[PDB]
Structure 1
Amino acid sequence: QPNDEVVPYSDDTWQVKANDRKYHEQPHFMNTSKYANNAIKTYKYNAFTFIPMNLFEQFKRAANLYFLALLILQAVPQISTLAWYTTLVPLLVVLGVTAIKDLVDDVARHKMDKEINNRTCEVIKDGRFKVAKWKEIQVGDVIRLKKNDFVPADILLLSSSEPNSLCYVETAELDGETNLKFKMSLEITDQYLQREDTLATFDGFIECEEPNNRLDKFTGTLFWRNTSFPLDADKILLRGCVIRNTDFCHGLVIFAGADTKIMKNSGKTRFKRTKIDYLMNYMVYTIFVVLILLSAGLAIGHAYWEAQVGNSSWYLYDGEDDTPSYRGFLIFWGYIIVLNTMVPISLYVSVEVIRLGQSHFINWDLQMYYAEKDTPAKARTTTLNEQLGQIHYIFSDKTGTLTQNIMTFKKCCINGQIYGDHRDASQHNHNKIEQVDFSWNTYADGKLAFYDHYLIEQIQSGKEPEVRQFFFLLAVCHTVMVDRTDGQLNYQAASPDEGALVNAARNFGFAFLARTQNTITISELGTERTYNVLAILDFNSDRKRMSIIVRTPEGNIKLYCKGADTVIYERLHRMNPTKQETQDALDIFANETLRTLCLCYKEIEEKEFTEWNKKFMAASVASTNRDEALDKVYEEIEKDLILLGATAIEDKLQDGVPETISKLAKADIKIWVLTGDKKETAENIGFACELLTEDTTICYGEDINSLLHARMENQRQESFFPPGGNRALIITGSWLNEILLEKRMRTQSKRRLEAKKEQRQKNFVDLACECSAVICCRVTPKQKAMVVDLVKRYKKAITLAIGDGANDVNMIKTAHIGVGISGQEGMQAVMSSDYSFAQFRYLQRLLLVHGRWSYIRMCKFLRYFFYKNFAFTLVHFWYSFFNGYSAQTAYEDWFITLYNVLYTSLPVLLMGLLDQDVSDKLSLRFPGLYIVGQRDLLFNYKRFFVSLLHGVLTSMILFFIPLGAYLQTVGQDGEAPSDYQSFAVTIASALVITVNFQIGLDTSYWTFVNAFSIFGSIALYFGIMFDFHTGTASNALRQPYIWLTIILTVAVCLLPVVAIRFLSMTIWPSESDKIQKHRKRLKAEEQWQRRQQVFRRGVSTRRSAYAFSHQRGYADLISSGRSIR
C-alpha cells in the first residue's frame, strides 16, 4: 500500500489581489496583518525584547538564581554586611558580559538575514517593472525572475519566455531531488500576460487555500476576465525553487515570508542548552544545599557556644539581650554570607569567556576554510562548544551535503567488453595514461575526462558497428532540449543522468543537434543525419525505462530503449550472446558504486508498427485514462529487445565524505542519511559513501514492518537481529509513516492509541539503532525532524544535523547541534544552523579536534573551578571551631574580593582556551580518543564530588598546618606575627601558591601565557597587597617560620596530588597518555583506501545498481509542441 516514489506531505479562505496592495491591506484582514511581508526573521532580539528575553534565558542558569538570592539577603539591614550599592553591580557586570556576547551573535545573524532580504528581484510597483529587495514584496505583487534566480515566494506562474509559458525549476533545496520539474501556466494567462505592459494593469483575484505545509499539492482558484480558472501545484513555484533553462518568468506572489509552504515546514526555534549546562545547574543546586547545611550546622554550634562560653564571657558583652538560640539563628545568615564564595560570581563569566574564545578557533581554522568558494567555518552560536565533543549520532542530508550535484559518465559495457579503464592503444600498457584527445570531434569539449583510448579507436575504426550504435542510442533515447542561440550547442537536460549520457555521447562523436515535434537531428561522426521520431515511450517511476521509436533516413523503423537492468532483462530476446557478459559488467559497476542503465533495441517491421501505431494513438487520444492505457501499448512493443550494453554514471561525492564517515565510525558516531531524494539515488550514495558495503544486508520498509509486528504480537529487550550480523535500513518516507503508525469513551481510547504509538516508536529506534547504517529517503522536512526527535527521546543521545537547503532546517533546529553547509547560493540551512562550514569533510575537525578539546577544556575548567573555591571557602568553616562559630573570616576583607577575580581568574581561563592533550594531527589520526566524550567520563557527577573532596581536604591542610605552627611559638619577638592578621596572610599566601601550582599540574599545554598567568597570579598577590599595606605582610612574610609554614603547607597539599596523578597514569593510563608516550615512535599512517575489489562469482545479480533521476510528462511535451519553440 505505501508508495515508494512520493514524499508524504499529507501525513504532516486566503485571498490575493494583483498590483492592488491597498485592498488586501483592509482593516478586516488586519489583526492585532494576516498577510506577512516577504522579509524573513531569524534573529531573536529585534528592538526591545532583549531585556525581557535575554534575562529570562539568562536565569535559566542555577547560579544566577543563587547570586540573586544572595543579593536579596545582603539587602536585609540586620544581617547585611555591605552597603547594597556595590553588591548588585557585580551581578549586573557579569550579566552584561553574557548579554553583550549574546547581542554580538544576534547582530551577526541579523546581518545574515539582510543578505537574503537584499536579493533584488524585480516587481511591479509603477507603470513598469522596478527592481526591489525581497522584503519589499507583499502578497499580490506581480514579479519577474530571470535564469538561476531563486523564487522570492510562492508565486502563481503567469507567463514566461518558453513557449506555452513553461518554466523549469530545480527543487534541490525544497527536496533532495536533483532534476528539473516543468511548471505550466493557464492558457488564458499565457496568451494575455506576455508583454510587460499588460502585467502592470493585471487585476486578478485568487481564492486559494490558507497557508499550509503541503508542497506537493495546492488548491485554489483565479477569478479574472469574468471567469473562474482553477489552479494546482503545477502552476505554483515554491520559495526555494531555482529557475533553470528559462530566460524570464512572471509570477504573482501568493504567499510571502513565513506563509510560504517551505517556511511553514521549518520547525520551531528552541533554546539550545549544552549537556554540561544542565550538569552545572545540578552542581550549583548541590552546593546551595551544602551551603545551607553547613551554615545551619555552624549556626547551631554557635548557639550551643553562646549558651555556656559566650554568655559567661564578660569581654563579649554587646548590650543586646539576645538569647543563645536567637544569636545562633542570626549567625546562620552570617555564614551564608561567609561561605557564599563557595560558588563565586565568576563561574559564568569564565564559561562565557571560554566558549567565546573556543568558538573563535572554529572561525579562524584554516583547515576548515574552503578556498574554492572562499568560505571559512562559522560558529554562529557561541554557547554550544563542549557539546561538539559529545555527539552520539549524525543525521545528514545528501543532495548538496554528501554530494556535489555533479554526475559524470565513467564506464560502459558494450558487447561484454567493459570500456572506461585506464588504457592506451589497443591494449593496456600502464596506469599513468593521459586524457583522451577529443580534438578530432568538432562538438566535443574538455569537460569529459575519459581515460581510455581503446574505445576511441573502436568508434573511429568502425570495425565493431555496435559500438557506434551504443552511443547513437544515448544521443536519441533521451528527452533533453538543445540550445544553439549562438552556436554553442548547450544541452538543457531535465535529468542529471540524461545530461551526463547525452553530453558523454556528444563528446564521442554522436551529438544531438536539433529536435522537433516529429524529427531528431543527431550528427554521427560529422555526418548530419536527421531521424524521424514516431513515438516517445515516456519514463515513469514504475516503468523504470524510457524508449523511443524512430525511422532512419533509409526508411527502416527502430526502437531504442534504456532503463533498469531488471525491467529490460525481462524483455530481452531469447537469443542474446551478450546477456551473460553484460550482467557481469552491471555487477562490476554495482560493486564500484555507480548508476547502471541497460541499453537495448529491436527491429520493427513496417506492418508490425502500423497495427501498433493505431493502438498507440488510441491510447494517447483517450484522455479518460491516458496514462494507464498508454502503459499497455508501451508493453506491447517492448517484447523482444536486443541487448547493447550498459552505462555507469558516477554521482560525485564531496571530497572527504567516504573518509569522514570511516573516521567518525572509529570515533563511534553513527551516521544516518535522512534525504528527500528517491530510493535508488539514496541507496547508491550509501554505497559510494561506504556506509553500505557488500557485507551489509539491506532491509527495507517491508522487512522492518514485519519485524516490528512480530514484537507487537509477541508481547500481546531481545535484539531484532543476531548480534554478530551486519545490517542496514533503507526506509522510505512512506514506509516510515507506516512503521511508526503515523499515517467518555472518546478520550479513554486515546491513551491506548498513544500508548501503542509510544511503544512502536521505541521499538523502531531500538531496531534502527541496532543497524550499522540507516538511510531514510523520500522523507518530508517534518519527518526529518521526527527521526531526530525519536533518537533524542528514546536513546537520550546527542544528535548532530548537517545539511543545506530549506528541507534540512527543521532537523537542524531539532538536533542538539545543527550544522549548515555554506558556500552555496542557497543559505536557508546556514541561517538556522549553529555552525556553518562549506564542506562535509570539515566535520572531522569540528568533532575530533574542536569538539573533542572543547569538552576536555571545559571539564578541566569545571574540575578546577570547584576546587579552588572549596579550598578557599572551607577555611572559614574550619576556623569556626576556633573563633566560637562567630563567622569570622580567616582572610582579610580585601583578599576575599580579589581572590575570585584577580588571583585565580586568569590561570584557568587560559587553560580553557589553550589546553591540548594531543596534537590536532594526532587527534584526527586517533578518532578513538573521542569516545571519552560519548560516555561522559571526564566530568561525571562523581568527578564533581571528587573535586569537592579535593577542595575539602586542601582546605583542611591550608588551615590546620598554619594553625599547628601558631598554637605554639612562631617567631615571637618584637615584630611577632602571632596575631590574626598574620594568621590571615599565611593561609592566604599558602592558598594562592597551592591553587596556582594545581593549575600548573592540571595544564598539559604550557604556552608562555599559560606559564605567565600561573606565576603572574602568584607574583601579583605578593605585590598587590603591599600596595594596600595595614603593614601586616611587611612583618608576617619576613619570618623564617612564616615561610617554613607556607612551604610545608604547599608541599603537603601538592605532593599527594602528584602521587595520585602519577599512579593513575602508570597503572591505568588513558587513551591520550598511551599516545603521548609513543608519540615519537608513531610513523605508520596509511591514507584511507577504498575497497579496490570485492569481485565475486556465483550469483547472476546480487544487487541492482539501477538509479535514474527523472520525471514523467517530459515526453508528452516533445510529442506535442509545448516544449518546441
Structure 2
Amino acid sequence: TWQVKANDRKYHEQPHFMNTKFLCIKESKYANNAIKTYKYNAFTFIPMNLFEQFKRAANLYFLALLILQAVPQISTLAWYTTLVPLLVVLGVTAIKDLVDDVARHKMDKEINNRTCEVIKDGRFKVAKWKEIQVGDVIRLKKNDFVPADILLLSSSEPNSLCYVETAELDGETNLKFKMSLEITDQYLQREDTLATFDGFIECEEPNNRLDKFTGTLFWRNTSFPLDADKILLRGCVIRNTDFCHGLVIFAGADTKIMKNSGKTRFKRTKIDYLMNYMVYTIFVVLILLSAGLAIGHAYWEAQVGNSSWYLYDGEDDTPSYRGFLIFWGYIIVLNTMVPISLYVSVEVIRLGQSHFINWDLQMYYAEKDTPAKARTTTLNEQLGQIHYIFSDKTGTLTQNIMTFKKCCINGQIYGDHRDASQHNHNKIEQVDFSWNTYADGKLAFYDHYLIEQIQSGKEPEVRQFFFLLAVCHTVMVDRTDGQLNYQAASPDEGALVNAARNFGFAFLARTQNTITISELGTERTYNVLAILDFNSDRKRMSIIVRTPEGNIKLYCKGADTVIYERLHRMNPTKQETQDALDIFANETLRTLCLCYKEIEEKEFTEWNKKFMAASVASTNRDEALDKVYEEIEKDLILLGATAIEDKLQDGVPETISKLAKADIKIWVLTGDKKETAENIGFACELLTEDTTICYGEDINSLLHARMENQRQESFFPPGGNRALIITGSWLNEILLEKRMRTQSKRRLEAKKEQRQKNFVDLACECSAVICCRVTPKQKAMVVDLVKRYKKAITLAIGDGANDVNMIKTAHIGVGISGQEGMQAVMSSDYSFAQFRYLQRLLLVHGRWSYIRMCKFLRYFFYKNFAFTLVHFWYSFFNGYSAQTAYEDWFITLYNVLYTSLPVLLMGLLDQDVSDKLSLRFPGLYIVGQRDLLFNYKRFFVSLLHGVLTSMILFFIPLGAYLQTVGQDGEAPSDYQSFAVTIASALVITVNFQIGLDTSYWTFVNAFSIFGSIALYFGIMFDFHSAGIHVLTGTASNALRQPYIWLTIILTVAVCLLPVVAIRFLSMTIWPSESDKIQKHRKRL
C-alpha cells in the first residue's frame, strides 16, 4: 500500500520504492507534483512525430517511391533529391506540430510555478508546485488552489475547519467542510511544531475515487484512521479560511483528479480516415495501370520492339523482362496521382483555418480579455461534422452567479416591474436602497410596491417573511472592517442573506446561542435554542429560537413538496402560494418555501428534553435527531416563497436552439445534483412544458422490457417529445457497470454489449439528455457509447478537471477559458470563454472548414489525375515505353508553381454564404452532418472528371498532330511542341476549373488564378531567365502558331464547357440549400 512520512523526503527515495522499468529506467513509485500535458518532451519528438506522420497512407506511399528510386536498374532520379522533397514535407508538419506543442509547454509552466508554501527547512519557505514531493508539509491561504492531495493538519478556523469549493472536481457550486483529526488539530497549530511533525501515513494506492478515501495515520505512539473528509484534492480551492496546513499524500499524476483524466489519444478527422481510403484506392489503381501497361510493353516488344533495328540497346533482355522492368518505370511515371503536396497543402489550409478561430473578434470575450484559441491545428473540418455535443453545466452553461430576483408573500408576487401602489408601466427605474444603511448596489431589483409594504408595516407578515431569511440561514459573517462581508458555504444562502440585508433585515453577527439580526435598523438579539440540520433526504432545514419577548417560534425553509405535507389545516395562502410557485417555476427560478408554527413553552420543554437526548446519543444521533425533527414539525403556517436565478451565460438558450436547428444533439453531462441539473435544463430551454421527463426508473423499465422481449422498435412513439434525467448512480445500474471461468465471461460481455446498445438507442431517441452526478470517468463513458454504438462525431465542451476525460475522449474537445481554472483548457482542442461562441465555431468556422476542405480534395485529385493520366494515354502511341507526355521540367513545377496557390487560397477564403447568413440558416450545417460534399462516391466522380479531362487533354492535340500543324521551316510537329501544347491546355484548363469551383472571388483569388497561368506562360517565354541574367526554345515556336493556339482553345473549351453545363444543370434541377440562398441573397 501507499506509504507517506512527514518532513522526510529520503524515506520515499529508498531503493525498494523504485518500481524500475524494463529498459533501464527507475520510475520511482512516488510521482513528483509536476504535471505534463505536452506530447514531445526533449527528444521523443522525432520517433513519436514520424510515427503519427506515417499513420497517413500517402507517407508510406511516398516512402515506397524513395525505395523504388534507389534501385539502379529502374532509378530515374539521383536519389539525393528525392529524399529532400520528402523530408521538407515531413519537416513542414513537424514544425507545425511543434509550435502547437510549444504552446502547451508554456501552459504547463504557469501551472507548475503556482508558488505554494512548504516546509523544506526549520520553517516554511516558498516553493513552486513542481517542487512539491510526497511527504511535504505545506501551508495555503485564502483562494489558493490545492497543489496536490493533502491531509488537513490545522487551520485558523475553530476545530481546524476548512471550506473548499469543488467546482473543478465536480459540478457542485457549494463549499465542502473539511476537518482535521482531533489530536492533529491541537498539536500542529503553531508553525514551528509543523516542522518537527513526524507522522507515518499508510493509505490506499492512487485511484480515481474522488468520493471516498481510506488510510491511517500513526503519530505520537497512536494510530488514527482517515477518511475523505480530511483530504483536499488537487482541483480544490481554499475558501473562507485565511490559512490551512496539509501533508502531501499524492502528487502529480498520482493525484486523485489526475487519475480521472483519460488517456491522451491521437485525434484524427473523419476526412483524415477518408484520405487514407482514397490513397489506398489510388495505389491499387496505380498498380493495376502499371501492370496493364507492363503487359502491353512485353507484348509490344515481342513483335514490334524486337524487329525495330533503331530500338537496339545492346541488351539481351527478353520481352518478358522488359515488361517486368517497365512496370516499375510506370510506377514512377504515374506516381503523381498522389503528389507530395497533398499534405503540405492540407496543413497550410488547416493552419490558416485555425488562425481564423484565434483571430475572430466575434469569438473574443472582451470582459475577460479571452480570445478564442485553436490549440490544435489538425481538427478543423471535423467542426463541420459534429453530431452530438456533450456539455458541462457548472461554468459552461452557467456563470456561477446566483442572484435574488423576486419574492411572494400571502399570494402576492413581489419583484415584477412596478411603481407606487399599482403597476403603471413596464419601464421602471432601479430601486433606491439608500434608505437602508447596510445596503449596497449588487442587487438589481425593480419593484417599489414591496418597498412601501415593508416600510408601511400594514402587512406584518411581510416583515416576518424577510426576517426569516436573516435567521433561518446558517452562514457566518465577517466584520473585520465593518463592511459586513458575508461568507456563505451555499451561494443560495449567500444571495438570500445579501438580498435580505438590502431589505432592512440584515444579519450582523452569530453566536452559539444568540444572533444579532437587525430589523429595519432595529437591534433585536434573538436566542438560538435548536438548529435543525440540512440534508438531502429531508430537503428542508429549520431553526428554533426564542424571541426577546419570550415567545418560541420555529422558522423553516426548504422544498415546497415536503413543507406542504406539514401544513396546518387552516392555511388560506396554501392555494395562492402554490400558484405563485408555478409562476416562479415556469420562470426557471429556485423557490424556497417559507413556513413557521407557534410553539408553546410547555410544548417546547417536552420536545426539548428529547432533542437533547438525541444530541447526546452516540449510536445513531443523526437518526435520533431526525426523529425529534419530525415530531415538532406537524402543522406549519406557510408564509410564502423566494425566487433566486442561477444566472446562465448569456446567449446559451439562443445557442442551443440554433445548434438544434443544425440537427446537433446537446447532452448535459454534469457532476452537480439532479435538481440543479434539471432546473438549468429548463432555463436553457432544453426541457419545456411539452417535454415529458423520464428518469432512471422509467428508463430501467423500458430497457429491461426490451431484453425480456428478445428472451428495432423505437422505445417511444415517433411523435413524442422526451428527455432523460439520469443520475450517475443510475447510469451504472442501467449499463450493468456495477474452464467455466473463461466460458461465462463471453456471455457476460454478450449481454453487457447488448445492454449498452439498448441505452444508446433509447438515449438518442430523446430530444435532450441530462446526466447528473456523473463522475469524470462516466462523462467519457457516455461520450464513448455514442462514438461506439452510433458512429457519431462528438463534441465535448466543459470547464474544470472533471471534463478533461470527456474532452480528451470526444472527437472534438472544447475548454472554457478566461476563468481562474484551466485544467480543461490545457487538454482541449479549441478554447473560448463563452458558450455562445459555439455557434460561430460550428456554423461558421466548422461549416466553412468542411466546405473548403472538401473543395480542395475534389480539385486536388482532379488536377492530378488530369495531369498524370496523359502518360497513360500516350502509352498506346509510344510502345508503352513509359515516356512522359510533358517536358521533364514541367512535371516538377506543376504541383509547386502552376496549380498550388489557387487551391490553397480557395481552401482559406471560400465562403458559400456570409457568416451573418450562415448563422441565420443553421440548416446549412446539416450538409456536413451527412457528409454530402465529399463521399467515397464523390471521390470517384473527381477521378472520372480527371480521367476524362486527360482524355481530352491528349486526344484533341493528338488529332491535330496526326495531321499537318503549321508545317513550315519552324514546324511544331515534334515531341517538344506536342508536350507544351498539352501542358498549356492542362494549365489553363485546371486553373479555369478552380475559378469555377471558387465562389468567393477575392482579389488574391483572382490574382492567383491568373497569376498561375501567367507564371506558366511567363516561365516558358524566357522571362524567368531574363530576370536571372539581369540580377530549349520550344515554347517560342509552338505557342506562336495559330493552330497550336486553336488546338489549345478547342481543348480547353471541350474540357470546361461540359462542366459548366453539368454544374448549371445540377444547380437548376437539384439546387442545394446554399444555392437557394445565393440566388435570393439580396432579398435576404
Is TM (by shorter chain) over 0.5?
yes
Secondary structure, aligned partner of 1:691 = coil
Question: Which of 286, 290, 302 is the matching residue for 2:285?
Answer: 290
Secondary structure, aligned partner of 2:474 = coil
Corresponding residue for 1:523? 518
Measured in 1, the distance between the counterparts of 2:116 and 2:884 equals: 70
Corresponding residue for 2:929? 934
Measured in 1, the distance between the counterparts of 2:915 and 2:588 equals: 32
Alignment of 1:835-846 (within 5 A): 835-846=830-841
Deviations 1:457-503 (A, max 9, x none): 00000000000000011111110111101101011111111111111
Corresponding residue for 2:1039? 1037
Deviation at 1:261, TM superposition (A): 0.4
Deviations 1:559-609 (A, max 9, x none): 011111100000000000000000001111111111111110000000001
Deviations 1:708-746 (A, max 9, x none): 111010110001000001000000001111111111111
Measured in 1, the distance between the counterparts of 2:223 and 2:627 equals: 36
Secondary structure, aligned partner of 2:187 = coil
Deviation at 1:186, TM superposition (A): 1.1
Deviation at 1:45, TM superposition (A): 0.4
Kindly indicate whether residue 956 of structure 2 is the aligned counterpart of residue 968 of structure 1: no
Paired residues of 2:146 and 2:235 also in contact (CA < 8 A): yes
The farther-off stretch of 253-262 and 318-327 is 318-327
Deviation at 1:1027, TM superposition (A): 3.5
Deviations 1:194-239 (A, max 9, x none): 1111112222211111111111111111111121121111111110
The farther-off stretch of 208-217 and 922-931 is 208-217
Secondary structure, aligned partner of 1:547 = strand
Paired residues of 2:155 and 2:245 also in contact (CA < 8 A): yes
Question: Which of 63, 67, 81 is the matching residue for 1:68?
Answer: 63
Paired residues of 2:457 and 2:463 also in contact (CA < 8 A): yes
Question: Which of 1059, 1062, 1065 is the matching residue for 2:1061?
Answer: 1059
Deviation at 1:189, TM superposition (A): 1.3
Secondary structure, aligned partner of 2:378 = coil
Secondary structure, aligned partner of 1:263 = coil
Alignment of 1:417-816 (within 5 A): 417-816=412-811
Measured in 1, the distance between the counterparts of 2:142 and 2:585 equals: 36
Deviations 1:765-793 (A, max 9, x none): 00000000000000000000000000000
Deviation at 1:175, TM superposition (A): 0.5
The farther-off stretch of 131-140 and 690-699 is 131-140
Paired residues of 2:540 and 2:558 also in contact (CA < 8 A): yes
Measured in 1, the distance between the counterparts of 2:176 and 2:328 equals: 73
Deviations 1:691-721 (A, max 9, x none): 0000000000000000111101011000100
Secondary structure, aligned partner of 1:267 = coil
Deviation at 1:455, TM superposition (A): 0.2
Deviation at 1:30, TM superposition (A): 2.1
The farther-off stretch of 601-610 and 225-234 is 225-234
Secondary structure, aligned partner of 2:736 = coil
Measured in 2, the distance between the counterparts of 1:83 and 1:630 equals: 90
The farther-off stretch of 1059-1068 and 691-700 is 1059-1068
Deviation at 1:1025, TM superposition (A): 2.8
Q: TM-score, normalised by structure 2?
A: 0.98
Measured in 2, the distance between the counterparts of 1:124 and 1:948 equals: 70
Deviations 1:990-1013 (A, max 9, x none): 100000000000000111111111
Question: Which of 248, 260, 263 is the matching residue for 1:265?
Answer: 260
Deviation at 1:749, TM superposition (A): 1.1
Deviations 1:634-676 (A, max 9, x none): 0000100000001111100001100000000001100000000
Measured in 2, the distance between the counterparts of 1:370 and 1:128 equals: 43
- Report how many aligned residue pairs link the two structures: 1070
Measured in 2, the distance between the counterparts of 1:481 and 1:188 equals: 26
Measured in 1, the distance between the counterparts of 2:742 and 2:643 equals: 57
Deviation at 1:17, TM superposition (A): 1.4
Deviation at 1:130, TM superposition (A): 1.3
Paired residues of 2:1018 and 2:1024 also in contact (CA < 8 A): no
Question: Which of 136, 139, 143 is the matching residue for 2:134?
Answer: 139
Paired residues of 2:384 and 2:928 also in contact (CA < 8 A): yes
Deviation at 1:989, TM superposition (A): 0.5
Secondary structure, aligned partner of 1:533 = strand
CA distance change for structure 1 residues 1029 and 1014 in 2, over 3 Å: closer, same or farther?
A: closer
Deviations 1:39-75 (A, max 9, x none): 1100010011111110001100000010011110111
Deviations 1:432-451 (A, max 9, x none): 10111110001111101110
Deviations 1:949-995 (A, max 9, x none): 00000000000111111100000000000000000000001100000
Paired residues of 2:406 and 2:642 also in contact (CA < 8 A): yes
Deviations 1:155-184 (A, max 9, x none): 011111111111100101100011011101
Alignment of 1:190-229 (within 5 A): 190-229=185-224
Deviation at 1:127, TM superposition (A): 2.1
Measured in 2, the distance between the counterparts of 1:867 and 1:277 equals: 18
Paired residues of 2:433 and 2:439 also in contact (CA < 8 A): yes
Paired residues of 2:476 and 2:488 also in contact (CA < 8 A): yes
Deviations 1:816-854 (A, max 9, x none): 000000000110000110000011000000000000000
Question: Which of 334, 338, 348 is the matching residue for 1:353?
Answer: 348
Deviations 1:355-405 (A, max 9, x none): 011000001100001011111011100000000000000000001000011
Secondary structure, aligned partner of 2:73 = coil
Measured in 2, the distance between the counterparts of 1:689 and 1:75 equals: 63
Deviation at 1:122, TM superposition (A): 1.0
Corresponding residue for 2:251? 256
Moved segments of 4+, more than 2 Å: 1025-1030
Deviation at 1:1028, TM superposition (A): 9.2
Deviation at 1:1026, TM superposition (A): 3.2
Question: Which of 835, 856, 870 is the matching residue for 2:865?
Answer: 870
Paired residues of 2:862 and 2:943 also in contact (CA < 8 A): yes
Measured in 2, the distance between the counterparts of 1:859 and 1:646 equals: 57
Deviation at 1:278, TM superposition (A): 0.2
Question: Which of 354, 368, 371 is the matching residue for 1:373?
Answer: 368
Deviation at 1:88, TM superposition (A): 0.7
Deviation at 1:542, TM superposition (A): 0.5
Measured in 2, the distance between the counterparts of 1:442 and 1:879 equals: 96
Paired residues of 2:912 and 2:1074 also in contact (CA < 8 A): yes
Measured in 2, the distance between the counterparts of 1:210 and 1:796 equals: 36
Deviations 1:1019-1050 (A, max 9, x none): 11111133399911111100111111011111
Secondary structure, aligned partner of 2:607 = helix
Secondary structure, aligned partner of 2:713 = coil
Deviations 1:897-918 (A, max 9, x none): 1101111011101110000000
Measured in 2, the distance between the counterparts of 1:612 and 1:412 equals: 33
Deviations 1:504-539 (A, max 9, x none): 111101011111111111100000100011111111
Question: Which of 306, 309, 316 is the matching residue for 1:311?
Answer: 306
Secondary structure, aligned partner of 2:16 = coil
Deviation at 1:125, TM superposition (A): 1.4
Deviations 1:413-456 (A, max 9, x none): 11000111000010011111011111000111110111000000
Deviation at 1:31, TM superposition (A): 3.0
Secondary structure, aligned partner of 2:347 = helix
Kindly indicate whether residue 393 of structure 2 is the aligned counterpart of residue 401 of structure 1: no
Measured in 1, the distance between the counterparts of 2:483 and 2:581 equals: 35
Deviations 1:80-137 (A, max 9, x none): 1111111111111100000110011111101111110111111111222111111011
Q: TM-score, normalised by structure 1?
A: 0.95
Measured in 2, the distance between the counterparts of 1:366 and 1:773 equals: 31
Measured in 2, the distance between the counterparts of 1:1052 and 1:1026 equals: 26
Measured in 2, the distance between the counterparts of 1:929 and 1:843 equals: 16
Deviation at 1:314, TM superposition (A): 1.1
Measured in 2, the distance between the counterparts of 1:234 and 1:318 equals: 90
Secondary structure, aligned partner of 1:866 = helix
- Between 1 and 2, higher relative CO (CA 8 Å, sep ≥ 6) is seen in 1
CA distance change for structure 1 residues 1029 and 175 in 2, over 3 Å: closer, same or farther?
A: closer
The farther-off stretch of 160-169 and 381-390 is 160-169
Deviations 1:19-50 (A, max 9, x none): 21122112221233111110110001001111
Deviations 1:931-952 (A, max 9, x none): 0000000000010000000000
